[PDB]
Design an enzyme around this catalytic site. Structure first.
Site, PDB file in Angstrom:
ATOM      1  N   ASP A 181      -9.784  18.399  17.541  1.00  0.00           N
ATOM      2  CA  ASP A 181      -8.911  17.374  18.127  1.00  0.00           C
ATOM      3  C   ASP A 181      -7.717  17.049  17.224  1.00  0.00           C
ATOM      4  O   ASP A 181      -6.614  16.808  17.723  1.00  0.00           O
ATOM      5  CB  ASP A 181      -9.693  16.075  18.388  1.00  0.00           C
ATOM      6  CG  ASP A 181     -10.349  16.001  19.780  1.00  0.00           C
ATOM      7  OD1 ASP A 181     -10.425  16.990  20.535  1.00  0.00           O
ATOM      8  OD2 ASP A 181     -10.833  14.890  20.116  1.00  0.00           O
ATOM      9  N   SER A 222      -0.141  27.378  21.475  1.00  0.00           N
ATOM     10  CA  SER A 222       0.364  28.542  22.223  1.00  0.00           C
ATOM     11  C   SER A 222       1.321  29.365  21.371  1.00  0.00           C
ATOM     12  O   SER A 222       1.300  30.607  21.400  1.00  0.00           O
ATOM     13  CB  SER A 222       1.079  28.091  23.505  1.00  0.00           C
ATOM     14  OG  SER A 222       0.188  27.514  24.471  1.00  0.00           O
ATOM     15  N   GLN A 262       4.421  23.266  16.038  1.00  0.00           N
ATOM     16  CA  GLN A 262       4.756  21.839  16.105  1.00  0.00           C
ATOM     17  C   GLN A 262       4.636  21.094  14.781  1.00  0.00           C
ATOM     18  O   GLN A 262       5.152  19.965  14.677  1.00  0.00           O
ATOM     19  CB  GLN A 262       3.835  21.139  17.116  1.00  0.00           C
ATOM     20  CG  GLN A 262       4.172  21.369  18.552  1.00  0.00           C
ATOM     21  CD  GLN A 262       3.166  20.678  19.490  1.00  0.00           C
ATOM     22  OE1 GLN A 262       1.987  21.050  19.558  1.00  0.00           O
ATOM     23  NE2 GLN A 262       3.628  19.665  20.186  1.00  0.00           N
TER      24      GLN A 262
END
Ligand SMILES: Nc1ccccc1Nc1nc2ccccc2[nH]1
EC number: 3.1.3.48
Length: 283
Positions: A181, A222, A262
């Site tokens: 998570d 991704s 990210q």
């Protein structure tokens, strides 16, 4: 510089955040005007993640051809990927329309439907053989054929039927179920094993349309998947594998979709995956 020793040099100097910010500063900026039209607001999960106009996937529809999805075409590696957001309740039919129209064999999913107590994407595939799904807006039927649950990932066989023509196709669903998570995995071993299973299926090969890969926004996990795959393929193709520059490959991919990778932790994890993967490929 080479990769494995550039890696230890960044670790010892603790400069991952500075390396990552350089990438953010040099990344391409192209228009995304179609994504921002008012009629497409409920087709985007995040207001700051949009496909560029020049590389967006168009639905074969005359009313509204928009989906939040991008074609990443890697010329030297001879690989293509479609990167997309996790489907929304009002875009599950569009998602499967794209799979059909682009002739994809495989779908790669890198998130769980619920993470951190919130929904990260719609339940867009059927969970029981005898309970199929019909998408009335795009006239498709989707059936679960078989499911194989392993410790780090699950593979599903699905049948997609175009109800207009009665044509059917077999789609493979590769679901990585153990990304934490928060943060990134401690070891890349299970992620690499998963990548190799996708490769072995044929889903990444030129005899099919591009693989569809998604997480929640379609840029972080991704991006890690396609960056690792392309770097490892280039190391097999070139005379000098130490010439493969992961930062240059990432900036090339960011010409086709914004924001890939990210966080600085995701960047470090991508280096680790390529480094360990390159040792297993040979010996
Ligand atoms: N490319 C090349 C040149 C000369 C001799 C062998 C190879 N093949 C190869 N595949 C690799 C995959 C990961 C890392 C290095 C690799 N080298």
């Amino acid at each position: 510089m080479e990769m494995e020793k550039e890696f230890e040099q960044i670790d010892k100097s603790g400069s991952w955040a500075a390396i990552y910010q350089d990438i953010r500063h040099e990344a391409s900026d192209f228009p995304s005007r179609v994504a921002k039209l008012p009629k497409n607001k409920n087709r985007n999960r995040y207001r700051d993640v949009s496909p560029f106009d020049h590389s967006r996937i168009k639905l074969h529809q005359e009313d509204n051809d928009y989906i939040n999805a991008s074609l990443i075409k890697m010329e030297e590696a001879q690989r293509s990927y479609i990167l997309t957001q996790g489907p929304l309740p009002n875009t599950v039919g569009h998602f499967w329309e794209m799979v059909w129209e682009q002739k994809s064999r495989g779908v790669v999913m890198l998130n769980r439907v619920m993470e951190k107590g919130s929904l990260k994407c719609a339940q867009y595939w059927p969970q029981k053989e005898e309970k199929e799904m019909i998408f009335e807006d795009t006239n498709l039927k989707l059936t679960l054929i078989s499911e194989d649950i392993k410790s780090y990932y699950t593979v599903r066989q699905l049948e997609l039927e175009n109800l207009t023509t009665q044509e059917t196709r077999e789609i493979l669903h590769f679901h990585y179920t153990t990304w934490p998570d928060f943060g990134v995995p401690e070891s890349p071993a299970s992620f690499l094993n998963f990548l190799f299973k996708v490769r072995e299926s044929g889903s990444l090969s030129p005899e099919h349309g591009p693989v569809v890969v998604h997480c929640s926004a379609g840029i972080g996990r991704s991006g890690t998947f396609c960056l690792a795959d392309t770097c490892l393929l280039l190391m097999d193709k070139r005379k000098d594998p130490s010439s493969v520059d992961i930062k240059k490959v990432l900036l090339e991919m960011r010409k086709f979709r914004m924001g890939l990778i990210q966080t600085a932790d995701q960047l470090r994890f991508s280096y680790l995956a390529v480094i360990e993967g390159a040792k297993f490929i040979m010996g």
